CSV table of C-alpha atoms and ligand atoms in Angstrom, one decimal:
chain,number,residue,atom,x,y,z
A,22,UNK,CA,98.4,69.8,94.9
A,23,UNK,CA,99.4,72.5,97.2
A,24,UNK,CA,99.9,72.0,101.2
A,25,UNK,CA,97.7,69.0,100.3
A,26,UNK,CA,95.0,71.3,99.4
A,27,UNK,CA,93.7,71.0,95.3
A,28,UNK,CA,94.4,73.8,93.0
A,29,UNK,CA,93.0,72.3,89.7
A,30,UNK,CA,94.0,75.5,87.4
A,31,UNK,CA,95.6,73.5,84.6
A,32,UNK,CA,96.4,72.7,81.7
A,33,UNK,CA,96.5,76.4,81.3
A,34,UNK,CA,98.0,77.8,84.3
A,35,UNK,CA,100.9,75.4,85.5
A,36,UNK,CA,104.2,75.4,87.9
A,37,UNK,CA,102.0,76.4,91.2
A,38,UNK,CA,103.8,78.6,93.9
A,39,UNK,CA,102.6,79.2,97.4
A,40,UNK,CA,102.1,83.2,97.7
A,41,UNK,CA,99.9,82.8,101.6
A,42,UNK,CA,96.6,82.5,102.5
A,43,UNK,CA,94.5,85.4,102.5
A,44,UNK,CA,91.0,86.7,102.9
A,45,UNK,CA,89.2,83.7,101.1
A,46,UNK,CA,91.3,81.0,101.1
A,47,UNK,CA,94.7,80.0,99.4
A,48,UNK,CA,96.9,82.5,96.9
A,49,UNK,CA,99.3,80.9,94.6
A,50,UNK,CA,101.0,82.7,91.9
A,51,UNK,CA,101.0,80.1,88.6
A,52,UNK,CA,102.5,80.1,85.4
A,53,UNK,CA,100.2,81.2,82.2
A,54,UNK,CA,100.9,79.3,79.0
A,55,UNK,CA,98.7,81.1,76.9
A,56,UNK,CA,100.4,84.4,77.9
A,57,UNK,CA,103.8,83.2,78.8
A,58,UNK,CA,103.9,85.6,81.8
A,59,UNK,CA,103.2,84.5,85.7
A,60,UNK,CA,99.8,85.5,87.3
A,61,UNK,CA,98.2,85.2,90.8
A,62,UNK,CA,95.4,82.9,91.2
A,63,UNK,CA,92.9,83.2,94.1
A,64,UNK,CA,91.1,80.1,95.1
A,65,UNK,CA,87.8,80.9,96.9
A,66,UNK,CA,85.1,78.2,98.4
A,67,UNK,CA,82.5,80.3,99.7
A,68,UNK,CA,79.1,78.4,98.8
A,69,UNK,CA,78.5,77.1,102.3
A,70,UNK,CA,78.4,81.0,103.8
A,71,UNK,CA,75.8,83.7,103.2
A,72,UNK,CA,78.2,86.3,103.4
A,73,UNK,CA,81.0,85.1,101.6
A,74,UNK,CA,78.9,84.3,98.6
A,75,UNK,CA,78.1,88.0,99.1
A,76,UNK,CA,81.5,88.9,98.8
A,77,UNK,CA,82.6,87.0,96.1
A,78,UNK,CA,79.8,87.8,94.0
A,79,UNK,CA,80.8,91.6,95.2
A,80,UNK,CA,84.1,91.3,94.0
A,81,UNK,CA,83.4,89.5,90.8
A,82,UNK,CA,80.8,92.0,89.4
A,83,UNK,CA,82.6,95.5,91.1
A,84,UNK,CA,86.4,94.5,89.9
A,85,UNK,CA,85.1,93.2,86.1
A,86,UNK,CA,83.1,96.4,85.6
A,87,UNK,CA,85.8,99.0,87.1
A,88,UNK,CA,89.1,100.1,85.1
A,89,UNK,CA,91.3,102.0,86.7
A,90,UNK,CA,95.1,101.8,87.3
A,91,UNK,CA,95.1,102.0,90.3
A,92,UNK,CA,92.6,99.2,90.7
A,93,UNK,CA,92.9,95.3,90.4
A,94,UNK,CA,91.4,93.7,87.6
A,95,UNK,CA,90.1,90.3,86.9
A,96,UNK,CA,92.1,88.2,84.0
A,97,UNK,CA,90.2,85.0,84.3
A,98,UNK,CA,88.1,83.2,86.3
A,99,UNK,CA,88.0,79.6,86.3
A,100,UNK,CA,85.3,77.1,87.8
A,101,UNK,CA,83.2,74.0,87.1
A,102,UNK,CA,81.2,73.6,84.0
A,103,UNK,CA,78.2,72.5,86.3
A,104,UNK,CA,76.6,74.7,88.9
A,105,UNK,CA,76.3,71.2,90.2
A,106,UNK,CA,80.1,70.9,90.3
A,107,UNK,CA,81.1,73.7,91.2
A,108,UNK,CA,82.8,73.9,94.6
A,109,UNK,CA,85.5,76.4,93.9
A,110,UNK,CA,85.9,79.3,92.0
A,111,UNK,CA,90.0,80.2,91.2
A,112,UNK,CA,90.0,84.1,90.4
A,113,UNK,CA,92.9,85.1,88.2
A,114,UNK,CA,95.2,88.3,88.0
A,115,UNK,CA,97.8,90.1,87.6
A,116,UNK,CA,100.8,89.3,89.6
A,117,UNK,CA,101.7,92.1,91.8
A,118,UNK,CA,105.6,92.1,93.5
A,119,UNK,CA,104.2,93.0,97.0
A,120,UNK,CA,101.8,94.9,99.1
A,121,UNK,CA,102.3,98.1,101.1
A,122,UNK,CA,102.1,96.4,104.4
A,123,UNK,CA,105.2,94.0,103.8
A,124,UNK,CA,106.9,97.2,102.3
A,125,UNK,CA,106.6,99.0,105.6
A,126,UNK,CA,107.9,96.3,107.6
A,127,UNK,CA,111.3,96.3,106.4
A,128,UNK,CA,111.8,99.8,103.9
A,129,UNK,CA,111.5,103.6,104.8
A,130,UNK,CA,109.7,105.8,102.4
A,131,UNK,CA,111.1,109.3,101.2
A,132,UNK,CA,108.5,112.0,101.4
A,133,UNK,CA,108.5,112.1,97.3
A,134,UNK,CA,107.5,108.5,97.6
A,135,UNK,CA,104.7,108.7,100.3
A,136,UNK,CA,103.3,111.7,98.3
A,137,UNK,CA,103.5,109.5,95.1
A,138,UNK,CA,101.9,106.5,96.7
A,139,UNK,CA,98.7,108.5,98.7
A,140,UNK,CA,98.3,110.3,95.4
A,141,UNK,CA,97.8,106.7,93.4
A,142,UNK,CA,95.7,105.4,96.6
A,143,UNK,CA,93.2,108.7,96.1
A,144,UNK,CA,93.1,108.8,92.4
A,145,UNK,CA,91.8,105.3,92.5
A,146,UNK,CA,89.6,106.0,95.3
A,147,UNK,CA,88.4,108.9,93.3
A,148,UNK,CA,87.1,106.7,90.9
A,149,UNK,CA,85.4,104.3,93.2
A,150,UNK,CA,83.4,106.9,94.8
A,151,UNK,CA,82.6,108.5,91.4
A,152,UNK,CA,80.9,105.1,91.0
A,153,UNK,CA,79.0,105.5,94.1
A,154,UNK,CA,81.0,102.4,96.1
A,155,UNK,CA,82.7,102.3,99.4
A,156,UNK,CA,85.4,100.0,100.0
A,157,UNK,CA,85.1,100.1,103.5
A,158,UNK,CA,88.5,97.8,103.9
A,159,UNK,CA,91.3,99.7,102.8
A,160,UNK,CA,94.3,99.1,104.4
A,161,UNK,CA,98.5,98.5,103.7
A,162,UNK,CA,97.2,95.0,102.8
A,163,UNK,CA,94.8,95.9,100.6
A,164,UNK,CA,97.0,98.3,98.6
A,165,UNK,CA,99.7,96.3,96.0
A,166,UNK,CA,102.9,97.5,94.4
A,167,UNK,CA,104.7,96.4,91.4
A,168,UNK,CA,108.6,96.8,90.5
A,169,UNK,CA,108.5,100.4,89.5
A,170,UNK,CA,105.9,101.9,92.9
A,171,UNK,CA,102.8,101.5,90.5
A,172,UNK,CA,100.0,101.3,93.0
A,173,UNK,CA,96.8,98.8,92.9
A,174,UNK,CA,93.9,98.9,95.6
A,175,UNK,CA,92.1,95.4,95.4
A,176,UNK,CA,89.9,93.0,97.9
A,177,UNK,CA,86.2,94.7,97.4
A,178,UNK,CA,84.3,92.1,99.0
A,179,UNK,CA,83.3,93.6,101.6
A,180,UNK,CA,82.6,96.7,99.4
A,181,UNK,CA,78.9,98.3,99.3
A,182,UNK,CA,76.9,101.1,97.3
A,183,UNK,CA,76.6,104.5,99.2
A,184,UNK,CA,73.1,104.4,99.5
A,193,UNK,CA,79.2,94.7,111.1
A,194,UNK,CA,80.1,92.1,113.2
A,195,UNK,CA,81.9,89.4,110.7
A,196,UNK,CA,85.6,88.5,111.0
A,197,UNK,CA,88.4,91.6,109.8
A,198,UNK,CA,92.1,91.1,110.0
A,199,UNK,CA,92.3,94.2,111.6
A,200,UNK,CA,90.2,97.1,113.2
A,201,UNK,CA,93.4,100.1,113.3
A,202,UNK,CA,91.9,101.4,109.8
A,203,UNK,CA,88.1,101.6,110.7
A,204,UNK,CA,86.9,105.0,111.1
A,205,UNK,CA,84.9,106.0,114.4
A,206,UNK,CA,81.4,105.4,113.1
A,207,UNK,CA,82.4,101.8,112.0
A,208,UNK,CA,84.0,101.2,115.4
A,209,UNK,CA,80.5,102.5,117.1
A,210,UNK,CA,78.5,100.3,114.9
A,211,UNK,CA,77.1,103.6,113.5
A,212,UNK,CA,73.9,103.4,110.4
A,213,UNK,CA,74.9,106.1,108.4
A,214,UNK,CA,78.6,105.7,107.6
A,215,UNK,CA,79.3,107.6,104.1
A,216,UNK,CA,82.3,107.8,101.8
A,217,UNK,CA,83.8,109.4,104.6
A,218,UNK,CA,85.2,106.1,106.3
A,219,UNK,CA,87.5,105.3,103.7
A,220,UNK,CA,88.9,109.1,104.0
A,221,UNK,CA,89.6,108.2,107.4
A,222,UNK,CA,91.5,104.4,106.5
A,223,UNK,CA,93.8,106.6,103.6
A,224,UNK,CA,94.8,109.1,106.8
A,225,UNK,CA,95.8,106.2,109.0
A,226,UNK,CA,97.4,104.5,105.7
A,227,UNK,CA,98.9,108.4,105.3
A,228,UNK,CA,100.4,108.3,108.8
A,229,UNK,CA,101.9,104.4,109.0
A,230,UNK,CA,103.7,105.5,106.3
A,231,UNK,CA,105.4,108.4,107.6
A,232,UNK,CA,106.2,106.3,110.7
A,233,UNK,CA,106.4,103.0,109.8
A,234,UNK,CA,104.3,101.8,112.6
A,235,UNK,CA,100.4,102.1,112.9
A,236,UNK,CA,98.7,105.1,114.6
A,237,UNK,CA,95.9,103.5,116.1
A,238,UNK,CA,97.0,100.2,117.0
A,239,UNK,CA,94.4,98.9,119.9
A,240,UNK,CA,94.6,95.8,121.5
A,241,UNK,CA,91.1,95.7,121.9
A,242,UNK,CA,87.6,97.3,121.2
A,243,UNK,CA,87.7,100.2,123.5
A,244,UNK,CA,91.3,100.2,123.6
A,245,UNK,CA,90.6,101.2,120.0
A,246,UNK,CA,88.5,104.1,120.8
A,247,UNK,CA,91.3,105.2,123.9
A,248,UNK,CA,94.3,105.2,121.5
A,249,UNK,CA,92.3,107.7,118.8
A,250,UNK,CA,91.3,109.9,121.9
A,251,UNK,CA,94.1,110.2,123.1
A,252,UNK,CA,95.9,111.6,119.9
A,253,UNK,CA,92.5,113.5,118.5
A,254,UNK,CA,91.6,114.7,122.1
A,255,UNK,CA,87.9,114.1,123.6
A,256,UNK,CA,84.7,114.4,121.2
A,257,UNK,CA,82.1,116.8,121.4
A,258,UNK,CA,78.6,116.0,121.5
A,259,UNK,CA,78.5,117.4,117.5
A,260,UNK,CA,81.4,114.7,117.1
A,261,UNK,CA,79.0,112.0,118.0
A,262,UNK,CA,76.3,113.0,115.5
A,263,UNK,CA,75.5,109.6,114.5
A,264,UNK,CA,73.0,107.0,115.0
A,265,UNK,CA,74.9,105.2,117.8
A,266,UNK,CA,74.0,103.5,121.1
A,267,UNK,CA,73.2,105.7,123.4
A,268,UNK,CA,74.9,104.0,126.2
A,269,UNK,CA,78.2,103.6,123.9
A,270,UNK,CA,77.6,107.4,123.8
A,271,UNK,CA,77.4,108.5,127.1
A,272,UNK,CA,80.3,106.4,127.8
A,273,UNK,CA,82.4,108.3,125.7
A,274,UNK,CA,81.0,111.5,126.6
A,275,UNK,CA,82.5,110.5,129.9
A,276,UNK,CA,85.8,109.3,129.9
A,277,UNK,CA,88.3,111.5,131.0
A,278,UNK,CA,89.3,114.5,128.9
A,279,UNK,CA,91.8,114.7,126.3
A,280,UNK,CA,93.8,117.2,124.3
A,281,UNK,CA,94.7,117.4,121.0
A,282,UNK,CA,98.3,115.9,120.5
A,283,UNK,CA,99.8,118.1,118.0
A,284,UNK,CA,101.0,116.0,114.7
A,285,UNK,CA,104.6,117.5,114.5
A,286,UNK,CA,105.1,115.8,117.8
A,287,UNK,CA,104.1,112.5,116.4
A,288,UNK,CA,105.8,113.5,113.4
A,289,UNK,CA,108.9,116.0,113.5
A,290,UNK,CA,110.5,114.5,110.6
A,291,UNK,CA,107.2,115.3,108.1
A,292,UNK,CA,106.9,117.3,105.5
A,293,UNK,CA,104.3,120.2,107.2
A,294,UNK,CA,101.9,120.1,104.4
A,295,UNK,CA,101.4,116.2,104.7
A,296,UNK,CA,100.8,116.6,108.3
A,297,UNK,CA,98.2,119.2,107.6
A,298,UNK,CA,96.1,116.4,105.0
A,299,UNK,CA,96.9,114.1,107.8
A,300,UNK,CA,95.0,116.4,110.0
A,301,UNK,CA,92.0,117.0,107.7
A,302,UNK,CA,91.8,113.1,107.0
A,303,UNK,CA,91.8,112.0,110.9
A,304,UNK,CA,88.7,114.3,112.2
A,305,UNK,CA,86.6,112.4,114.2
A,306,UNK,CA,83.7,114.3,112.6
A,307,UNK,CA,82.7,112.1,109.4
A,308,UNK,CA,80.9,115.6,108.3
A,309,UNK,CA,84.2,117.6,109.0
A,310,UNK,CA,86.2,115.1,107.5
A,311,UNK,CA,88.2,116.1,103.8
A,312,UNK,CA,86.5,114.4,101.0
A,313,UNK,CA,88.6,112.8,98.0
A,314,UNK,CA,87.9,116.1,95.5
A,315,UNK,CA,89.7,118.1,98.4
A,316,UNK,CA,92.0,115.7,99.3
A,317,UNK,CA,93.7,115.6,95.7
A,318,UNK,CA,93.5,119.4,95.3
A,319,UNK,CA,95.6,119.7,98.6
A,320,UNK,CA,98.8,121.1,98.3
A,321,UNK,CA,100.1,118.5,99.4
A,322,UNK,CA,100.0,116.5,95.9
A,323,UNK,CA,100.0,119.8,94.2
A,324,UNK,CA,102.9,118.2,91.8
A,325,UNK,CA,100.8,115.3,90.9
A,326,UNK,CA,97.1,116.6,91.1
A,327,UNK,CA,95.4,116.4,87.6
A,328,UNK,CA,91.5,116.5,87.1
A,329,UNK,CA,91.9,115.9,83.6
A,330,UNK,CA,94.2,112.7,84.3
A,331,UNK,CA,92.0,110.9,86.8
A,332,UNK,CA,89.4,108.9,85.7
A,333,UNK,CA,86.3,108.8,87.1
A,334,UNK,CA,82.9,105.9,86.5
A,335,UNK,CA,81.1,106.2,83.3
A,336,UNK,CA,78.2,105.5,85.5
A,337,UNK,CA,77.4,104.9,89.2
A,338,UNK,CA,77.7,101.6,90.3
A,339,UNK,CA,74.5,99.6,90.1
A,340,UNK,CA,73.8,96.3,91.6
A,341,UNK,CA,70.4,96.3,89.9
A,342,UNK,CA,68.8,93.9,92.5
A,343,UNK,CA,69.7,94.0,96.5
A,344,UNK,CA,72.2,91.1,97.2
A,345,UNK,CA,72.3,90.8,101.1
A,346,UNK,CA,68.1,89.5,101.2
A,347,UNK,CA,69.1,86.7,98.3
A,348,UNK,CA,69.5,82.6,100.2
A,349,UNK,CA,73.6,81.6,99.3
A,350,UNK,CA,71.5,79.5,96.7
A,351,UNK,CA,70.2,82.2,94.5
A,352,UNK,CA,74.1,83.7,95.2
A,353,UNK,CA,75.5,80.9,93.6
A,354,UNK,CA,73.9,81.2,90.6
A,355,UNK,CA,74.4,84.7,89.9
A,356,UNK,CA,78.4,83.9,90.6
A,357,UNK,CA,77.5,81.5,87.9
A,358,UNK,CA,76.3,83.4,85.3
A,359,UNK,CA,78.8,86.5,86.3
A,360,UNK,CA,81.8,83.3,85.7
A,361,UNK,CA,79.8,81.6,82.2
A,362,UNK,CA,82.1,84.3,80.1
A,363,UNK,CA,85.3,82.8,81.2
A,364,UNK,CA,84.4,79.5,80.2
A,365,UNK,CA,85.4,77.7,76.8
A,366,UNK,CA,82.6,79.1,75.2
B,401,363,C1,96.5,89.7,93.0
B,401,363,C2,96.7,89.6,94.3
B,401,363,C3,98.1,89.6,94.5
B,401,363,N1,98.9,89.5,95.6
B,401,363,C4,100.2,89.6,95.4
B,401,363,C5,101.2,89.6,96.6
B,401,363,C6,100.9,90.0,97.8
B,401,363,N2,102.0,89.8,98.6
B,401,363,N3,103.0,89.2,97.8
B,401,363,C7,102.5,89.1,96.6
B,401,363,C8,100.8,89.8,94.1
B,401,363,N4,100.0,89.8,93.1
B,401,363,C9,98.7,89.8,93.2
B,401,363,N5,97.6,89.8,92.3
């Protein structure tokens, strides 16, 4: 009952509006009767996929046992009463009035504002690494604003416990390891996504936007110069590595060139964020004790996990059979009943 495609969310959630389709399917925002306010509704059908079973059961268990905010919840989830039945599974939430990558298309951010918003996109970061989890897919997308700049980092479904070849929207985020289909990528890769996030929002435009997979790798290079072999310390093809280790030589492009207009402390975090060296790289402690955010920086006002996150059992081994019927039992609470 929406671009010809069912969205059975009633009685309770009512007056359907098209919001776009996303990473798993449709996104409406609805009407909730019970608490007479207007949610979004995510409608996913991932049981014929391994891997988005995977994700959906990711983002089910991660988002219902984390409270943060500056992280999504989960209101409601509705599905069939049947594992049988079930085809669809319609995850509700709070309704958020846009994300940070439709902000930056049309608004520019004062340098109080783009200190505000990385300190909220690092204070719930903070939390998620205090629970042992990388998001691994953080991006202006990813990160949601409501009416008065309060900032919300959702979409963990392709998060995993710190202990890749399927579909993204986009690469410019993905630290160097990722991109060089590394084994040992750390917390470290989502320091690097919150730099690039750092610097599209001081420019408005992206700072490694590649047209293609080594294009990727060029435009980083040719802002962050040409790696050493310490740089290229992970477990990566050798061939990929050589290849690197070859192309020709570039210097470090100074960030007040990229960015005269920047406040000088913001450009030095920007600088500790984007080393290509995962082991050089700021972590998230550091990051929010950087002058930078010295106004907003509060270890006693940032929550951290009661407990690392735990998925008891390994998920990734289990058939999209057995990962249906754990996204049932995670979804019997929400039932009438
Ligand atoms: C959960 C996802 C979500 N997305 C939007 C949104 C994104 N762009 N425009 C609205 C608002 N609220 C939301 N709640």
């Amino acid at each position: 009952m929406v671009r010809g495609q069912v969205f059975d969310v009633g009685p309770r959630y009512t007056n359907l509006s098209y919001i776009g389709e996303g990473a798993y399917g449709m996104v409406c925002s609805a009407y909730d009767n019970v608490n007479k306010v207007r949610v979004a509704i995510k409608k996913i059908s991932p049981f014929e996929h391994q891997t988005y079973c995977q994700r959906t059961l990711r983002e089910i268990k991660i988002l219902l046992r984390f409270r943060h905010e500056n992280i999504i919840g989960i209101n409601d989830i509705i599905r069939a009463p049947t594992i049988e039945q079930m085809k669809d599974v319609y995850i509700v939430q709070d309704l958020m009035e846009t994300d940070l990558y439709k902000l930056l298309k049309t608004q520019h951010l004062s340098n109080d504002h783009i200190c505000y918003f990385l300190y909220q996109i690092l204070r719930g970061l903070k939390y998620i690494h205090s629970a042992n989890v990388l998001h691994r897919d953080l991006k202006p997308s990813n990160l949601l604003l409501n009416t008065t700049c309060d900032l919300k980092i959702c979409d963990f479904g392709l998060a995993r416990v710190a202990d890749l070849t399927e579909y993204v929207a986009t690469r410019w985020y993905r630290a160097p390891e990722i991109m060089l289909n590394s084994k040992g990528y750390t917390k470290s890769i989502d320091i690097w996504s919150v730099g690039c996030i750092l610097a599209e929002m001081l420019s408005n435009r992206p700072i490694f936007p590649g047209k293609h997979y080594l294009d990727q790798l060029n435009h980083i290079l040719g802002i962050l110069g040409s790696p050493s072999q310490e740089d290229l310390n992970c477990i990566i093809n050798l061939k990929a590595r050589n290849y690197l280790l070859s192309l020709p030589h570039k210097n470090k492009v100074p960030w007040n060139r990229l960015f005269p207009n920047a406040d000088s402390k913001a450009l030095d975090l920007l600088d500790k964020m984007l080393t290509f060296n995962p082991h050089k790289r700021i972590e998230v402690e550091q990051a929010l004790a950087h002058p930078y955010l010295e106004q907003y920086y509060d270890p006693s006002d940032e929550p951290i996990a009661e407990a690392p996150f735990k998925f008891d059992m390994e998920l990734d081994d289990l058939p999209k059979e057995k990962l249906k019927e754990l996204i049932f039992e995670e979804t019997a609470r929400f039932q009438p009943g």
